[PDB]
């Protein structure tokens, strides 16, 4: 336990002169109790990796001996708090110390020990029945929205000996006891899980459902899959919190865990105020979205060890919450900054530069992170189901896709929502490139789309083909001059314009159109494509049959229809009923057919 | 606190470059300070870097010249470097180490603090809201700087970024005069300039300018000349930031700190790393350079529960005008926005030549707004940007084709471009244009055009502002 | 207009120089004041040296502190010529305490050739066997160190406290 | 001429200022002198010897 | 054929950067000239 603390070749120091202890074990240094992790062992001594500053550490300092590795406390009260990369209850320490800066020797438990919770036992299990790891024996009403379930720790089982009745108890108190063959072990409300292992699952089920998004753009063109993995380019000023908030408010998930690197207090306070402002009326009542969030973030300053540990803390928390039979979306923000963090930790290892300083195990870390996702059948008796999605926001270095990390991530994702800053400069939102965006999970979604819509996929293929054909005709008419082209392709031009101006834009500042239901989206697309097909057929047939039908004849006979199409978006489903909207759209389609018949 | 005596030494194992090594040390500690005595009586300080058993390593600031193997008294303070902070620093000039160099007396310390100091808790961070006027029209009118908006200025060899920095310093001020004349008497602005890696002529020019403006009551200057020892070049930023944090979070002052020629800081960090004998990095810079520059820059912003703020304005040079050089790249991933100076415009004899086209600012969306200022700041900037862009384009097209092919609007565009480059950018060294006067001159330039061509300004303000 | 600009520039530079010199004069006066106070402290301490009754206890404490510091098999103590029996008695008292404290056998000598200068008010310098490590635990060094450590409190006493400083931490 | 008279008067006023603050500082010292000296000498006298906290048998 | 011939060196990086920038400026200039010529063509072939 001698503190043989050396000097530094960076922001980290090492030590020696102790007894035998396993590596990747967390011990404390000095009277300040700094975070330290064994990395290297030689002989009867072991190097350590201290995270805090290395100032003032002297020889002969104590080194406390422990028996556990880096781990995360898991239990009730996590929802609504603000944590760093090593799980420090930052609001609570600011409350306790009344300090301005980060205090040292932070010996505060991640959760409080003076807050009582209402306990409901399972009212089915009796003392003496055998319980396995992952079975729920209790629930907590953490808040009106989410009920923080409690499960037996994995890698444990035995025959129960005590069951506690409902009551108001704290974390330290004992509620469940049991008895393995030979010994017996009590169980409190808190479990601890090492970070660098994956909690088990019974089996992994294919993702077979769409992840809803607020706007019809990127929800009908390039949908995501619930529990999937996706990449979204994003930069300063483009607007990245738009999708964050959209997934927080209008989506079928159940919790949001936002994890980044080098974050600002702007986003923290913004989400804090969006909790009571950006609410959701689940049952007609607004509620703080704090209850549906657990923020984690690190700001430059933080020693690179914690900055790199944040991502694993986040995925561990997300997995602990998915095991409770819920849905999750983990915003893996600051991905390029995370690659920079990887480079920075490898800086103090003298490792061979694979490519511009990337450690050799860069690919290993990519694989170990991005793969822990998907939908999984939970491990327990009541047979829950839940999934974790990951959304790694790509942050290219000034639009250059030369990073090996960017390409490596772009080979794992199947969905891409490209962003063009110039389209945002054109006052068009959402700013989607419309050509580089793709979605290869279309096959997984074909089965969902058939069973309930039976028409959307033809419309989605027609929309993509029309989008390419409009660019082809744009090339034709920049060569010609936009004054000499037949009517046959002018109808394609006009429909493409109408889809662009109405269906491929959704104003988040419009009071009632901040969320387009997907059945509504299908209705609008069906009506517009029906108009397109009818006009195209009419002009093609009359091009030689009789009475050549042109842009002007059609336009004049359907100024009413054109304005009605342009005014479809002003429906307000919030107040007007769904039946009203669908009936009115069907009537509008009928009117289109009647007008085209009255033409001929 | 500590009342134990001090332990000296005369053993010295070996010496190598800017390092000294001595053993038989009794319970050393990291980053301990040491006072050395030479055979001739000269005294040179140093800092500890490596410790192992009894062996120890210090680093002499003043340089290893003529150190004797036996006749050297190496002494141990028993502590780490501590800054004698005090409010009455203001109006003084110090060297790198903090020793006064303006013929004055030793500092009378109000307190002591860690030279590294402490970093700010992210929960106690307040989003910047209001803007600090610089006295330059090219920046204020088109590009707002909120409180704590860490914006760097990218420059290179031969460019007059030094004069621009001096102008910003001597013309610094607030926009609290928007309320009333009598109420503006409550001024709470201070400056802490930190010349580092600066040649003699520049350092003295800064001193002369600061004395000339007569605002030395609110200017604390740290000079580190080129010929000074290289190890002291990495200590001065910490001292400046610690004094700024003191004056901000203890006396509730608003502070604008400036650091100049950070490329010299990068060179110093490179050299100390090379002496440390560590694995190089990309372009030989230390691998942990990003972390170091992070713990330097970030000490800035606002904190809840305090009436005070800090604002960091770094300045750095670009080797061979290489925008992809590591220093500006790693500075990009911390700071916010980018200011540029155009070589051609310097060649056209236009002072100060700030290129508005590549300039950016992320906080400009909310740093300006209604109530805090007039309603006509952001829209005016966008309109002027569009007008200048199309004016340069029309100048290019005139060069391509000829004057005979220009329309009336093209003539207006060319006249606007010439008048803009003659009036707005050209400000002269001493013209202190306020924000209001800057918007007024922008209106004067926009008067060339008919209101119809001004499509980026909404009609709601054109019916109020164009007929004047 | 050229001459007017020149005249006003001369006005401003002159006034700025006067302000600077005034402030520097004030600061120099304060520094001289504190220096005089420290010199008085030195003189009063030198007066207090004369009282043998408590000087013996102080020397005992100083020697014990030095012995506790150096922790080596060989030791040498150095003291003024005129206080030799006092340091002898203090060391003979100090040795058993050191043995009972550290659980180690050490040998302590007194040198008889080299001595502290005459101007030394008092104190003790302790070397090791090979004279390569020392702790000049002398009275003036203690005064200087203790004064420099407590300097902000001295300023607080001699000039009150600055109201504009609202918070301490 | 007006400016020269102004510099003369302003220098006289500034010297008057320096005189009054110097007198105030002298009075401030003379008010409280013995307390700090007694405290300082008491701190010098105190010894409280002990061993380095990290020594072991 | 596929690539310019020059030894890899930092001065060569700056030189090829200058060559590319000159090519881009000439590109833009001749596009503007072409636009002027097309406008002239259209207004002389009007009626």
- Asked if A470 reaches chain D (Cβ–Cβ under 8 Å), the answer is no
**How many CA atoms does the CB half-sphere of C107 hold within 13 Å?**
4
Contact yes or no for E32 and B320 at CB 8 A: no
Which residues face A377 on adjacent strands? A203, A385
* Three-class DSSP category at B120: strand
**Nearest Cα residue to B339 out of B134, B191, B139:** B139
Which residues face A447 on adjacent strands? none
For residue D45, give how far its alpha carbon lies from the nearest alpha carbon of chain B (Å): 11
* Three-class DSSP category at A568: coil
Return all residues near A376 (Cβ < 8 A) that are at least 6 apart.
A201, A202, A203, A204, A205, A322, A385, A386, A387
* Three-class DSSP category at B74: strand
Residue of chain B with shortest Cα separation from D55 = B27
**Nearest Cα residue to B372 out of B207, B139, B197, B177:** B177
**How many CA atoms does the CB half-sphere of C5 hold within 13 Å?**
3
A236 is in an annotated binding site: yes
Contact in structure between A136 and A150 (CB atoms under 8 Å): yes
* Three-class DSSP category at A439: strand
Which tokens belong to A431? 């700013």
For residue D7, give how far its alpha carbon lies from the nearest alpha carbon of chain B (Å): 16
Angle between helices B200-213 and B161-170 (to 10 degrees): 20
Round to the nearest angstrom and report the end-to-end CA distance of chain B.
70
Q: What technique was this entry resolved by? A: cryo-EM
B376/A165 Cα distance (integer angstroms): 66
Tell me if the bond preceding A342 is cis, omega within 30° of 0. no
Contact in structure between B152 and B340 (CB atoms under 8 Å): no
Pairing state of beta strands B153-155 and B219-222?
Answer: unpaired
A558/A440 Cα distance (integer angstroms): 38
**Nearest Cα residue to B312 out of B331, B326, B325, B329:** B331
Is the torsion defined by CA of A95, A97, A99, A102 positive or negative?
Answer: negative
Contact in structure between B223 and B195 (CB atoms under 8 Å): yes
Which tokens belong to A277? 């402002």
Tokens 């990337």 label which residue?
A: A358
Task: Identify the residue among B54, B106, B108 best suited for mutation to test binding to C, counting C beta carbons within 10 A and taking the highest.
Answer: B108
Q: Which of residues 26-55 of D touch A (CB under 8 A)?
A: 52-55
Return all residues near A402 (Cβ < 8 A) that are at least 6 apart.
none
For residue D29, give how far its alpha carbon lies from the nearest alpha carbon of chain C (Å): 6
Tell me if the bond preceding B304 is cis, omega within 30° of 0. no
Contact in structure between A330 and B277 (CB atoms under 8 Å): no
Which tokens belong to D46? 């105190």
HEC profile of A224-257:
EECCCEEEEECCCCCCCHHHHHHHHHCCCCCEEE
Residues of C in contact with D47 (CB under 8 A): 58, 61-62, 64-65
Task: Identify the residue among B156, B393, B400, B407 best suited for mutation to test binding to E, counting E beta carbons within 10 A and taking the highest.
Answer: B400
Contact yes or no for B401 and E33 at CB 8 A: yes
For residue B43, give how far its alpha carbon lies from the nearest alpha carbon of chain A (Å): 24
B362 is in an annotated binding site: yes
**Which residue among A6, A10, A301 places its CB closest to the CB of B295?**
A301
D56/A2 Cα distance (integer angstroms): 10
C126/C79 Cα distance (integer angstroms): 9
Q: 10 Å Cβ neighbour count for D17?
A: 12
Return all residues near A360 (Cβ < 8 A) that are at least 6 apart.
A351, A352, A354
Return all residues near B311 (Cβ < 8 A) that are at least 6 apart.
B132, B145, B147, B148, B149, B150, B255, B256, B257, B300
**Nearest Cα residue to A430 out of A217, A259, A197, A204:** A217
* Three-class DSSP category at B384: helix
Residue pairs between chains C and D whose CB atoms are closer than 8 Å: 73
Return all residues near A461 (Cβ < 8 A) that are at least 6 apart.
none
Which tokens belong to B173? 């001020």
HEC profile of A289-337:
HHHHECEECCCCCCCHHHHHHHHHHHHHHHHHHHCCCCEEEEEECCHHH
Residues of B in contact with D46 (CB under 8 A): 3
Residue pairs between chains A and B whose CB atoms are closer than 8 Å: 126
Count of residues for chain C?
A: 169
Contact yes or no for D52 and A60 at CB 8 A: yes
Q: Which of residues 23-82 of B touch D (CB under 8 A)?
A: 26-27
Contact in structure between B89 and B107 (CB atoms under 8 Å): yes
Contact in structure between B426 and B351 (CB atoms under 8 Å): yes
Contact yes or no for B30 and A99 at CB 8 A: no
Chains A and D, touching by 3 or more CB pairs within 8 angstroms: yes
Which H or E run contains B378? helix B378-400
Which residues face B146 on adjacent strands? B131
* Three-class DSSP category at B229: coil
Q: What is the dihedral of CA A583, A586, A592, A597, to 10 degrees?
A: -110
Residue of chain D with shortest Cα separation from A3 = D54
C87/A89 Cα distance (integer angstroms): 58
Contact in structure between C78 and C113 (CB atoms under 8 Å): no
A132: left (phi over 0), alpha (psi -120 to 50) or beta: beta
- Asked if B111 reaches chain C (Cβ–Cβ under 8 Å), the answer is yes
A224/A448 Cα distance (integer angstroms): 13
Helices (H), A115-222: none
For residue A1, give how far its alpha carbon lies from the nearest alpha carbon of chain D (Å): 12
Which tokens belong to A346? 């490898």
Which tokens belong to A235? 């930069």
In order of A501, B283, B330, D2, the CA distances from B325 in angstroms are: 43, 9, 9, 58
Contact in structure between A293 and A79 (CB atoms under 8 Å): yes
Contact in structure between C162 and B246 (CB atoms under 8 Å): no
**How many CA atoms does the CB half-sphere of C102 hold within 13 Å?**
24
**Nearest Cα residue to B392 out of B341, B429, B432, B344:** B344
Which tokens belong to A526? 């069906």
Which residues face B21 on adjacent strands? B14, B57
Residue B37 backbone phi and psi in degrees, to 5: -130, 130
Residue B9 backbone phi and psi in degrees, to 5: -150, 160
Contact in structure between A46 and A52 (CB atoms under 8 Å): no
Contact yes or no for B3 and D54 at CB 8 A: no
- Asked if B397 reaches chain E (Cβ–Cβ under 8 Å), the answer is yes
Helices (H), B67-159: 137-140
Going from the N-terminus, what domains does chain B have, and what CATH number goes with each? 1-468 (3.40.50.12240)
Residue of chain C with shortest Cα separation from B79 = C149
- Asked if E38 reaches chain B (Cβ–Cβ under 8 Å), the answer is no
Which tokens belong to B50? 């490596």
A422/A428 Cα distance (integer angstroms): 9
* Three-class DSSP category at B43: strand
Q: B14 exposed, middle or buried (CB, 10 Å; 0-12, 13-18, 19+)? A: exposed
Tokens 């009419």 label which residue?
A: A538
Scored b (16 or more CB within 10 A) or e, B158-169 reads ebebbebbbbbb
Contact in structure between A471 and A489 (CB atoms under 8 Å): no
Is the torsion defined by CA of B105, B109, B110, B116 positive or negative?
Answer: positive
Return all residues near A284 (Cβ < 8 A) that are at least 6 apart.
none
Contact in structure between A218 and A437 (CB atoms under 8 Å): yes
Contact in structure between A394 and A225 (CB atoms under 8 Å): no
Q: 10 Å Cβ neighbour count for A490?
A: 18
> Quick one: how many helices (H) and strands (E) in chain C?
5, 4
Task: Identify the residue among B121, B245, B293 best suited for mutation to test binding to A, counting A beta carbons within 10 A and taking the highest.
Answer: B121
- Asked if B320 reaches chain E (Cβ–Cβ under 8 Å), the answer is yes
Contact in structure between B251 and C165 (CB atoms under 8 Å): yes
């Amino acid at each position: 336990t001698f503190g043989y603390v050396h000097g530094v070749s960076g922001p980290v120091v090492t030590a020696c002169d102790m007894a035998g202890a396993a590596m990747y074990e967390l011990v404390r240094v000095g009277h300040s109790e700094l975070v330290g992790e064994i990395i290297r062992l030689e002989g009867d001594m072991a190097t350590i990796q201290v995270y805090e500053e290395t100032s003032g550490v002297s020889v002969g300092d104590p080194v406390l001996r422990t028996g556990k590795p880096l781990s995360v406390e898991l239990g009730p009260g996590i929802m609504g708090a603000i944590f760093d990369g090593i799980q420090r209850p930052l609001s609570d320490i600011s409350s306790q110390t009344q300090s301005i800066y980060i205090p040292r020797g932070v010996n505060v438990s991640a959760l409080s020990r003076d807050i009582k919770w209402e306990f409901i036992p399972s009212k089915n299990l009796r003392v003496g029945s055998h319980i396995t790891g992952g079975d729920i024996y209790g629930i907590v009403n953490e808040n009106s929205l989410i009920k923080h379930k409690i499960m037996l720790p994995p890698r444990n089982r035995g025959s129960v000996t005590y069951i506690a009745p409902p009551g108001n108890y704290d974390a330290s108190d004992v509620v469940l006891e049991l008895e393995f063959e030979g010994v017996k072990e009590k169980f409190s409300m808190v479990q601890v899980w090492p970070v660098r292992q994956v909690r088990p699952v019974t089996e992994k089920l294919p993702a077979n459902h769409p992840l809803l998004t607020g706007q019809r753009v990127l929800d009908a063109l390039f949908p995501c899959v619930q529990g999937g993995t996706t990449a979204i380019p994003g930069a300063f000023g483009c607007g990245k919190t738009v999708i964050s908030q959209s997934l927080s408010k209008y989506s079928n998930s159940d919790v949001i865990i936002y994890v980044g690197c080098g974050e600002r207090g702007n986003e923290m306070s913004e989400v804090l105020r969006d909790f009571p402002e950006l609410t959701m009326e689940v049952d007609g009542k607004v509620e703080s979205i704090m209850k549906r969030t657990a923020l984690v973030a690190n700001t430059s300053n933080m020693p690179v060890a914690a900055r790199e540990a944040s991502i694993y803390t986040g995925i561990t928390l997300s997995e602990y919450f998915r095991d409770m039979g819920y849905h999750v979306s983990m915003m893996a923000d600051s991905t390029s900054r995370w690659a920079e963090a990887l480079r920075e930790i490898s800086g103090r290892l003298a490792e061979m530069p694979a490519d511009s300083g990337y450690p050799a195990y860069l690919g290993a870390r990519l694989a170990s992170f991005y793969e822990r996702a998907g939908r999984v059948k939970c491990l327990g008796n009541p047979e829950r189901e839940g999934s974790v999605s990951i959304v790694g926001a790509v942050s290219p270095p000034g639009g250059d896709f030369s990073d090996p990390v960017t390409s490596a991530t772009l080979g794992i994702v199947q969905v891409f929502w490209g962003l063009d800053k110039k389209l945002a400069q054109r006052k068009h939102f959402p700013s989607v490139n419309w050509l580089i965006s793709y979605s290869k999970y279309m096959r997984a979604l074909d089965e969902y789309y058939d069973k309930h819509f039976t028409e959307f996929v033809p419309l989605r293929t027609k929309a993509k083909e029309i989008l390419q054909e409009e660019e082809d005709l744009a090339e034709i008419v920049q060569l010609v001059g936009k004054a000499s082209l037949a009517e046959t392709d002018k109808i394609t031009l006009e429909v493409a314009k109408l889809i662009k101006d109405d269906f491929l834009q959704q104003n988040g500042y419009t009071p009632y159109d901040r969320f387009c239901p997907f059945y509504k989206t299908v209705g609008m697309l069906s009506n517009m494509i029906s108009f397109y097909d009818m006009a195209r057929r009419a002009v093609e047939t009359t091009a030689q049959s009789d009475n050549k039908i042109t842009w002007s004849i059609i336009r004049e006979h359907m100024g009413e229809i054109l304005y009605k199409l342009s005014s479809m978006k002003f429906k307000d489903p919030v107040k007007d009923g769904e039946a009203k909207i669908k009936a009115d759209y069907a009537q509008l389609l009928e009117d289109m057919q009647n007008a085209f018949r009255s033409l001929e | 606190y500590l009342s134990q005596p001090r332990l000296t030494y005369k053993t010295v194992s070996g010496v190598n470059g800017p390092l000294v090594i001595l053993d038989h040390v009794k319970f050393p500690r990291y980053a301990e300070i040491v006072h050395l005595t030479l055979p001739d009586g000269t005294k040179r300080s140093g800092q500890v870097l490596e410790v192992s058993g009894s062996k120890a390593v210090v680093q002499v600031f003043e340089g290893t010249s003529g150190i004797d193997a036996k006749k050297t008294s190496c002494e141990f303070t028993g502590d780490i470097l501590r800054t004698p902070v005090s409010e009455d620093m203001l109006g003084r000039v110090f060297n790198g180490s903090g020793k006064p160099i303006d013929r004055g007396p030793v500092v009378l310390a109000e307190d002591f603090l860690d030279i590294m100091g402490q970093p700010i808790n992210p929960q106690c961070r307040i989003y910047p809201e209001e803007m600090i006027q610089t006295g330059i029209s090219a920046i204020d009118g088109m590009n707002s700087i909120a409180r704590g908006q860490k914006i760097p200025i990218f420059s290179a060899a031969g460019l007059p970024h030094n004069e621009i920095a001096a102008q910003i310093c001597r013309q610094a001020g607030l926009v609290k005069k928007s309320k009333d004349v009598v109420d503006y008497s409550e001024e709470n602005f201070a400056i802490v300039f930190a010349a580092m890696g600066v040649n003699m002529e520049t350092a003295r020019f800064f001193k002369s300018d600061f004395e000339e403006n007569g605002s030395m009551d609110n200017v604390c200057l740290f000079l580190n000349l080129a010929n000074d020892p290289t190890i002291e070049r990495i200590i001065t930023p910490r001292l400046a930031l610690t004094t700024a944090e003191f004056l901000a979070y203890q006396c509730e002052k608003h502070v604008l700190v400036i650091l100049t020629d950070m490329s010299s800081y990068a060179e110093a960090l490179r050299e100390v790393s090379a002496a440390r004998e560590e694995v190089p990095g990309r372009r030989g810079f230390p691998g942990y350079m990003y972390t170091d520059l992070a713990t330097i820059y970030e000490r800035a912003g606002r904190v809840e529960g305090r009436n005070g703020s800090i604002t960091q304005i770094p300045i750095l040079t670009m080797p061979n005008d290489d925008i992809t050089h590591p220093i500006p790249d790693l500075t990009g991933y911390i700071t916010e926005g980018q200011i540029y100076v155009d070589r051609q415009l310097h060649n056209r004899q236009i002072y100060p030549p700030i290129n508005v086209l590549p300039s950016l600012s992320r906080l400009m969306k909310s740093a300006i707004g209604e109530g805090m200022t007039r309603k006509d700041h952001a829209d005016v900037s966008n309109q002027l940007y569009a007008c200048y862009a199309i004016g340069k384009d029309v100048q290019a097209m005139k060069a391509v084709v000829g004057e005979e092919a220009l329309t009336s609007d093209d003539l207006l565009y060319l006249e606007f471009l010439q008048k803009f480059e003659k009036n707005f950018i050209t400000q002269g060294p001493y013209e202190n244009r306020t924000v209001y006067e800057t918007l007024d001159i922008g209106w004067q330039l926009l008067r060339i055009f008919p209101k119809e061509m001004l499509k980026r300004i909404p009609q709601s303000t054109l019916s109020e502002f164009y007929p004047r | 207009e050229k001459k007017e600009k020149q005249i006003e520039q001369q006005k401003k530079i002159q006034m700025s120089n006067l302000m600077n010199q005034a402030r520097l004069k004030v600061l120099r006066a304060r520094d001289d004041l504190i220096t005089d106070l420290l010199n008085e402290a030195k003189q009063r301490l030198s007066k207090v040296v004369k009282d043998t009754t408590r000087y013996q206890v102080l020397l005992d404490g100083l020697v014990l502190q030095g012995l506790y510091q150096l922790l080596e098999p060989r030791m040498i103590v150095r003291c003024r010529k005129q206080d030799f029996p006092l340091v002898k008695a203090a060391v003979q008292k100090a040795i058993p305490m050191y043995k009972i404290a550290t659980k180690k056998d050490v040998d302590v000598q007194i040198d008889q050739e080299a001595y502290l200068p005459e101007e030394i008010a008092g104190g003790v310098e302790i070397y090791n066997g090979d004279r390569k490590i020392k702790v000049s635990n002398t009275l003036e060094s203690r005064l200087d160190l203790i004064a420099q450590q407590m300097m902000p409190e001295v300023r607080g006493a001699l000039f009150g406290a600055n109201a504009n400083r609202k918070f301490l931490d | 001429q007006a400016a020269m008279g102004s510099q003369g008067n302003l220098s006289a006023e500034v010297e008057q200022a320096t005189r009054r603050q110097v007198q105030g500082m002298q009075s401030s010292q003379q008010r409280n002198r013995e307390r700090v000296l007694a405290q300082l000498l008491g701190m010098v006298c105190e010894v409280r010897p002990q061993v380095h906290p990290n020594y072991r048998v | 054929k596929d690539r310019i011939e020059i030894f890899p060196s930092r001065m060569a990086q700056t030189i090829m950067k200058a060559r590319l920038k000159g090519a881009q400026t000439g590109r833009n200039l001749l596009k503007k000239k072409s636009d002027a010529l097309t406008l002239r063509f259209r207004q002389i072939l009007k009626k």
